[PDB]
Design a protein around this ligand. Structure first.
Ligand SMILES: Nc1ncnc2c1ncn2[C@@H]1O[C@H](COP(=O)(O)OP(=O)(O)O)[C@@H](O)[C@H]1O
Ligand SMILES: Nc1ncnc2c1ncn2[C@@H]1O[C@H](COP(=O)(O)OP(=O)(O)O)[C@@H](O)[C@H]1O
Lengths: 343, 628
DNA sequence: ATCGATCGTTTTTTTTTTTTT
DNA sequence: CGATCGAT
């Protein structure tokens, strides 16, 4: 539900169960396992989803007035049509608080902003509305990324890299505020990702701007004929019965939903000494990467994302001070999908 | 009569502030004292002070205001009478403030009228001044016409019965535009609060009006705090209002107008906040109440002399605005000269002479060349930034129209173009199309530009400098081709830009770990930044002062900038065999204002040959930096 | 001054061609 | 449906 803040306050009895959930080291996988209603294949990313479920940390910059580094969290899913990215995330539109669902060729750049035209209410025309500035902090499930004109997608550079807007038209001229996190379901110019041609070029984008992203946890068809039958039968029987069971996958009515909700507000991850120093040592070989012909490599924006991931995963477990394990799942998150182009 | 209590109330409010009002002092007599000579008739009054002395007339005020409002003007006149030999020319504009409650477009009913509430929103589709001669003189035709009465109502009616005679009571006299009562307003519209952005419904818009002193100080992109003078609107005709209709059918013994009223809104206070800067005579947080050229222009000389005297403050100030940053220490000293003044001569009708200088950044990827400038929009006034592809070539131009709204063709502004005496830098100078590029090819140098195809005698002008964002072909500085092929760009702009300062990347572990050692004091949430030498307030005030000086050259290096420049082109007599390069007098112009600004640092006039030598050093730096 | 008989009274539309960037 | 205008 929505974000008034005042009309959503929870009782202490629910806090019992919330910190109960927090009392599971199983909680690292429980809510990611409670993401799907019934989908039981290779949820290994749903932990990577969940850092945006628990939608990011608030590293404010009311401190120095300088450099305004939000804990910017940006991840996209990309792969083949087999994956239910559109349908998963059509359902996740029925999850996200600021649920949006547009995609390539639903609305232009001005189809996202400045819906300007006549108004017979005033008997005059007016400067008027947009899309993103309504979705601050939110998400739009998005597909068919490689579909838009260059007019759009050079806006996204602006926001993804500054999270800003300053506008100039003949009528109103504006320097507004706009900022949020991604979900998307980009696709290539192909039907299947071409074997022996990485998404380094398969999806249609430039040389190191492809490299620029934090990490897009790759998707692709499961290359195994066998497992179809299991769920072709189980999740058709799901329809055949037209109801569920509260099995070990205990689907909470709302006990899941306030650990989502309440854990946006009263939490403030802090760093003492834990989740920083590993790559602050290992950067030797992490920046022996200067060598390479036409490649894309390691850069010193990675650790920014690492700290952000870290405070995110400390959001789960509610560790007011730093979590250290978050590093380990961060390194896992990386090198499960950073060796997709060793070539 | 009802409001005689309000009469006596503001009467004895005057009579109290006729004595002291605040510590033997009054806050609303010296505004009135400045009023007394021109008699402009605007004085804001603190709403708190009603609760201070009048003891909660707020609730005596904030409902029956619209009816009580006029009596405040009579009260005002009674104030001005007591000590000034007075005529009734006096009037009452008010720009109320010191009010707590802040409501929005939704709590609207029949019950919301005659209040003073403060409200914000946005500003859109503005509209112009349109005067009003609200009053005049009008009665029967013969002689008995001297009519300064109450005839100024919104609903206007020439027809009056009589004053002295039995005479015409529909046949009127003629009009007075000469010695009577007139005033002004405008009319604009407002969209829903961007601080209150719910789902579903539209941005419900309100009508808005402004009195005299409020005028032409509203503007697009701004939020406000109004009065709460919601209205019965003296409207004239409308459709769809098919409710019951009434009118007075008088006494039987032995004109018509359909009634459907609409809504608008009116207001008599503004604090256009988030749009307020103030130059240097404004007392800041840190001041020194002293005597000076002006009020506070440099009345902190008590320190600014010190901030203009050290031989260390150069490097200290180079380090007093990059606490969270570490890189080379050449742009950290050069880039400020872009923000720092130039030449400012006082000279002939030859042609416009320029003060500003072109400025560049190039570097390898992920070097925080952006973070140099991401802050600069938050830093300087007039100088707001976005990208060039952040808009179209309705960045330079306006949005080109081919439909009829007012006269069917409108390109009269832009986005680069409204940066008058601030810079609006841009990123990504390499892949942008060659339209604004060739526009800038002269718009930076010959800051007097024109267009065709829609021109209302097109003559526009750039005003400030620039910041560049190049990156090489391969993403790396692989020394496998010449610079002219390393960037694949043109000559004259590589000479128009008299200052390059490229930021090259390497791999040495101590560097990167030293950066993470910066990070040691980036999230230590107490002490997440490094020490400094000079607070920002004094910094910008010294900057705001150091221009007003008339910089000068009479120096033998001014005489023998011929010598240093002759050597400049002596050593650059080559730069022609191995990958030839070009020298040009824009370089001299740039060095000139560069040396001049370098002495403007000194809070002093009158250039010194030290500045020439450092400028020569820096030009040598840039040109040998251009060497492959 | 009062009443009554005199005088004079009117408003409704939406869309297609060539032009300019 | 309005104002002019005449006499009673
Ligand atoms: N785990 C799953 N649960 C339900 N449906 C699935 C699952 N995996 C695949 N699908 C099916 O695969 C299809 C995915 O297509 P879709 O993702 O919408 O194409 P695109 O990848 O272009 O968005 C959907 O119709 C969906 O029903
Ligand atoms: N000396 C430094 N001080 C602060 N941040 C730095 C420094 N060097 C590198 N960085 C970081 O490296 C990143 C550089 O990315 P950036 O250069 O903006 O990308 P691009 O190369 O696309 O412009 C920034 O986020 C910045 O925080």
């Amino acid at each position: 539900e929505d974000e008034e803040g005042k009309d959503h306050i929870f009782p202490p009895e629910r806090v019992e169960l919330l910190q109960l959930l927090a009392k599971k080291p199983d909680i690292y996988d429980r809510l990611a396992r409670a993401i799907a209603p019934s989908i039981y294949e290779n949820d290994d990313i749903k932990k990577g989803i969940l850092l945006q479920l628990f939608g990011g940390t608030k590293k404010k910059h009311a401190t120095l007035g300088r450099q305004n580094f939000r804990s910017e969290i940006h991840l996209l899913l990309c792969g083949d049509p087999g994956t239910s990215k559109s349908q998963m995330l059509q359902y996740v539109f029925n999850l996200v608080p600021r649920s949006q669902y547009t995609s390539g060729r639903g609305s232009s750049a001005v189809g996202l902003t400045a819906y300007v035209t006549k108004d017979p209410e005033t008997r005059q025309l007016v400067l008027q509305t947009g899309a993103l500035v309504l979705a601050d902090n939110g998400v739009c499930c998005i597909d068919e990324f490689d579909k838009m004109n260059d007019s759009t997608r050079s806006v996204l550079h602006e926001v993804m890299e500054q999270q800003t807007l300053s506008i100039a038209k003949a009528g109103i001229i504006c320097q507004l505020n706009a900022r949020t996190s991604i979900l998307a379901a980009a696709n290539p110019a192909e039907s299947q990702w071409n074997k022996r041609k990485n998404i380094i070029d398969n999806v249609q984008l430039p040389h190191t701007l492809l490299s620029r992203f934090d990490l897009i946890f790759l998707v692709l068809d499961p290359q195994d004929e066998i497992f179809d039958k299991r769920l072709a039968s189980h999740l058709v029987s799901l329809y055949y019965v037209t109801r569920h069971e509260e099995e070990d996958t205990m689907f909470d009515m709302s006990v899941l939903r306030d650990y989502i909700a309440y854990a946006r507000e009263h939490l403030s991850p802090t760093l003492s000494d834990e989740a920083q120093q590993r790559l602050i040592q290992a950067y030797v070989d992490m920046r022996k990467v200067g060598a390479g012909r036409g490649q894309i490599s390691a850069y010193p924006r990675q650790l920014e994302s690492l700290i952000r991931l870290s405070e995110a995963h400390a959001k789960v477990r509610l560790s007011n001070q730093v979590e250290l394990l978050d590093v380990e799942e961060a390194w896992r998150l990386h090198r499960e999908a950073l060796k997709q182009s060793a070539t | 009569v009802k409001d005689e209590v309000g009469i006596r109330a503001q009467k004895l409010f005057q009579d109290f502030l006729e004595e002291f009002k605040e510590d033997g002092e009054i806050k609303y007599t010296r505004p009135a004292a400045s009023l007394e000579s021109p008699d402009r008739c605007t004085l804001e009054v603190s709403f708190e002070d009603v609760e201070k002395y009048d003891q909660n007339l707020a609730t005596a005020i904030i409902e029956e205001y619209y009816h009580i409002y006029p009596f405040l003007c009579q009260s005002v006149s009674n104030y001005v009478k007591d000590r000034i030999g007075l005529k009734t020319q006096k009037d009452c504009y008010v720009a109320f403030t010191e009010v707590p409650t802040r409501h929005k477009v939704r709590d609207l009913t029949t019950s919301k009228i005659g209040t003073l509430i403060r409200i914000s929103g946005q500003v859109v589709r503005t509209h112009p001044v349109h005067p009003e001669l609200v009053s005049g003189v009008f009665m029967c035709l013969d002689c008995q016409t001297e009519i300064r009465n109450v005839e100024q109502q919104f609903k206007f009616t020439n027809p009056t019965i009589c004053r002295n005679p039995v005479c015409s009571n529909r046949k009127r006299f003629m009009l007075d535009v000469e010695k009577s009562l007139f005033l002004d307003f405008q009319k604009i519209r407002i969209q829903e609060t961007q601080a209150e952005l719910p789902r579903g419904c539209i941005p419900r818009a309100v009508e808005i009006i402004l009195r005299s002193e409020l005028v032409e100080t509203v503007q697009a992109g701004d939020r406000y705090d109004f009065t709460g003078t919601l209205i019965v609107v003296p409207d004239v005709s409308v459709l769809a209002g098919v409710g019951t209709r009434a009118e007075n059918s008088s006494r039987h013994k032995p004109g018509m107008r359909e009634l459907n009223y609409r809504m608008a809104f009116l207001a008599c206070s503004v604090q256009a906040t988030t749009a307020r800067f103030g130059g240097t005579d404004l007392p800041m947080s840190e001041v020194t109440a002293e005597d000076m050229k002006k009020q506070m222009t440099d009345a902190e000389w008590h320190k600014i002399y010190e901030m203009s005297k050290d031989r260390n403050l150069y490097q200290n100030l180079i380090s007093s605005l990059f606490p969270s940053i570490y890189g080379n220490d050449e742009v950290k000293r050069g880039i400020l000269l872009q923000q720092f003044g130039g030449v400012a001569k006082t000279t002939t009708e030859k042609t416009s002479l320029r003060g500003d200088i072109n400025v560049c950044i190039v570097g390898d990827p992920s070097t925080a060349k952006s973070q140099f400038l991401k802050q600069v929009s938050d830093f300087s006034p007039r100088a707001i930034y976005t990208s060039g592809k952040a808009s179209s070539a309705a960045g330079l131009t306006a949005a080109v129209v081919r439909d009829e709204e007012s006269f069917d063709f409108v390109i009269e502004a832009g986005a680069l173009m409204l940066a008058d005496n601030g810079i609006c830098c841009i990123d990504e100078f390499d892949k942008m199309d060659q339209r604004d590029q060739v526009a800038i090819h002269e718009a930076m140098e010959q800051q007097t530009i024109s267009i065709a195809r829609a021109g209302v005698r097109a003559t526009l002008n750039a005003r400030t400098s620039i910041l560049a964002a190049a990156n090489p072909i391969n993403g790396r500085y692989d020394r496998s081709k010449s610079l002219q092929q390393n960037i694949q760009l043109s000559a004259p702009i590589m000479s128009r830009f008299d200052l390059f300062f490229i930021l090259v990347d390497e791999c040495n572990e101590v560097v990167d770990y030293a950066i993470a050692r910066k990070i040691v004091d980036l999230h230590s949430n107490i002490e997440e930044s490094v020490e400094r030498a000079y607070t920002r307030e004094e910094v910008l005030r010294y900057v705001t002062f150091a221009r007003q000086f008339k910089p000068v050259i009479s120096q033998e290096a001014g005489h023998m900038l011929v010598e240093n420049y002759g050597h400049l082109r002596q050593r650059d007599t080559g730069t022609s065999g191995r990958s030839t390069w070009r020298i040009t007098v824009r370089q001299l112009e740039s060095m000139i204002r560069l040396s001049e600004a370098m002495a403007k640092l000194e809070c002093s006039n009158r250039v010194l040959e030290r500045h020439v030598k450092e400028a020569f050093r820096l030009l040598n730096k840039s040109i040998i930096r251009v060497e492959q």
